[PDB]
Design a protein around this ligand. Structure first.
Ligand code: HEM
Ligand code: HEM
Ligand code: HEM
Ligand code: HEM
Lengths: 145, 141, 141, 145
């Protein structure tokens, strides 16, 4: 699914990711950038402003579980489908999230990677993480029915 | 609909970009061709290697029309008229590719202006690029 | 946008439909829910069972909105103002799903009126269903 | 790729398709409904009216060849990637076709089936052919680079 050339660029960059805060910045921005997605997270409390969303503790901590889910999906890249089976069922049956929304969280996460890694986040590193998020997203979409 | 903060965020981010516009246009394109290979089918007559003069040149033009678009945020349908016809009817670029380019425009600006690329500035830019590419896809059929 | 012949074919087709518009809107929904299961995420509190009387009732309202649009092909932006809000400001349905329904509608019309569904009327309907959806997804970015 | 039931609905109907014309009808509707796709077919000739397009010998002949590849992928539903690998490279390297357009041919074809089989083209039957046409589209898209 991923060449050793790309696999190196991905894990090379992932190994540097602040695992405590890259996910909460990605989820927070999903809610700032795409305000309608907020209706799925009302249980999270105060989301009335970008500053409130970006400093929200449930947002930050749900973001870490999402990042852990990408992390664990990287460790199973040759069968993403299997690694996202129960999360696909969850997002479908329980959460009623349109998978067309999955694309938006991958793109925001990439943007978060770009924001933090700067000149290190070159076109080639990006293309590979685009490969990853697209495949994570399609795996999360696979078990809709 | 862009709000007043959208406009001032877009204009302020664009002022920081400064003379690096065409350079970012050129990088944005290359990232697009690279991360989303199917967009390359629209430039078959192009040399698409990194450094390509031809991509640099087109990069400038795309930069220039987005700059033209920063100054006309209240009537983008007037400012982008010639360009609306070109992409929508002459070239028939599918709307999805615009999302691909807009996204890579975000990455390039996140990469180069990280302090400026706050969650709010991110959203105002997304709102901006989407409005520009809604104009450029309107004239189809 | 839509040519004079496009408007002519939609009207004449819609006149063949007659009393069946609500059946067809129900069937198109049934076809969208079935062929494109992700569209069911927009109806989590609906009975989406095969032959559901709820889906039938929703079917009638889609049909009625479409009949309305036939009678207003001249300015769908204004006719469809109210409905444009509902699909952005409470629902925010991704534009793709409008593609799924439009398609499942043409399939519905071809299944019942093959003799009227000439390539040229097929073509006119596609522009129409796509024209409606464009206004129902305006209010987005 | 399909279930046993899906395979029967898909193959059941396909045994009833006229192979000499369903493909030509589908491609000519492609050109009528989406006139911009006629850019890709200038060597075909008088593409000037719906009637010119619908009676055109080269459209019928190409259309036939397209449908035949649909049957090929039907024989080989288990590996659509393999079966559409060379076609995928052709539309990439040679015809420079945006894979986004592939679903327009799939869709127009589903309409032709709808038109011919009327009440027999039921929602469950249609839903299986959608899995097929999007599998075919994915497979034709797989080798773009
Ligand atoms: C990029 C694709 C996505 C991935 C990998 C992902 C990941 C996850 C994970 C790992 C969980 C389980 C966390 C837990 O509760 O233990 C989760 C739950 C959840 N997801 Fe996602 N997600 C994605 C997209 C989305 C999107 C786009 C939305 C909304 C528009 C969404 C809405 C939710 C909600 C509401 C929950 C439950 C939160 C809670 O009740 O605490 N997901 N997601
Ligand atoms: C941010 C939105 C975009 C803007 C502002 C933009 C702007 C431009 C400009 C300034 C030109 C040059 C016209 C000239 O030289 O006279 C052009 C042409 C062109 N555009 Fe775009 N563009 C955008 C998005 C896209 C996308 C997404 C595609 C498809 C992947 C695309 C494909 C093309 C092609 C094939 C040409 C003709 C290029 C040539 O032959 O030199 N554009 N556009
Ligand atoms: C051809 C384009 C469409 C038309 C003309 C249409 C028409 C309508 C109509 C007439 C209503 C009645 C509500 C009212 O009067 O306020 C409605 C509501 C609604 N529509 Fe659509 N619709 C279209 C496409 C879609 C699509 C593609 C989806 C998502 C798959 C969708 C989701 C909904 C939902 C969730 C409601 C509210 C239902 C409820 O909560 O009871 N619509 N629409
Ligand atoms: C998933 C849908 C599609 C399938 C299954 C398909 C299949 C085929 C096949 C089998 C051929 C070779 C015909 C032969 O050997 O003589 C071909 C060639 C070709 N295709 Fe497609 N195709 C699809 C979509 C498209 C689209 C969307 C376009 C453009 C709008 C396109 C444009 C062409 C052109 C220009 C040729 C060369 C025809 C010629 O020989 O002049 N195709 N395709």
């Amino acid at each position: 699914f991923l060449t050793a050339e790309e696999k190196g660029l991905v894990n090379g960059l992932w190994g540097k990711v602040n695992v405590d805060e890259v996910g909460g910045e990605a989820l927070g921005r999903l809610l700032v950038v795409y305000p309608w997605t907020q209706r799925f997270f009302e249980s999270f409390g105060d989301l009335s402003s970008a500053d409130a969303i970006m400093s929200n503790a449930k947002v930050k901590a749900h973001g870490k579980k999402v990042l852990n889910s990408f992390s664990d999906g990287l460790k199973n890249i040759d069968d993403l489908k299997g690694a996202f089976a129960k999360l696909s069922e969850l997002h479908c049956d329980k959460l009623h999230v349109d998978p067309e929304n999955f694309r938006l969280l991958g793109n925001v996460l990439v943007c978060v990677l770009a924001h933090h890694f700067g000149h290190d986040f070159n076109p080639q590193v990006q293309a590979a993480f685009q490969k990853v998020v697209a495949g994570v997203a399609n795996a999360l979409a696979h078990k809709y029915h | 609909v862009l709000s007043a903060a959208d406009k001032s965020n877009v204009k302020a981010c664009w002022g920081k970009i400064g003379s690096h516009a065409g350079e970012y246009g050129a990088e944005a394109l290359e990232r697009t061709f690279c991360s989303f290979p199917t967009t390359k089918t629209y430039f078959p007559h192009f040399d698409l290697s990194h450094g390509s003069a031809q991509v640099k040149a087109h990069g400038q033009k795309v930069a220039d029309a987005l700059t033209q678009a920063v100054a006309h945020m209240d009537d983008l349908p007037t400012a982008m008229s010639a360009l609306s016809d070109l992409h929508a009817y002459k070239l028939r670029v599918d709307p999805v590719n615009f999302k691909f380019l807009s996204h890579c425009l975000l990455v390039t600006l996140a990469c180069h202006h990280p302090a400026e690329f706050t969650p709010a500035v991110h959203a105002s830019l997304d709102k901006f690029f989407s409005a520009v590419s809604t104009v450029l896809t309107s004239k189809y059929r």
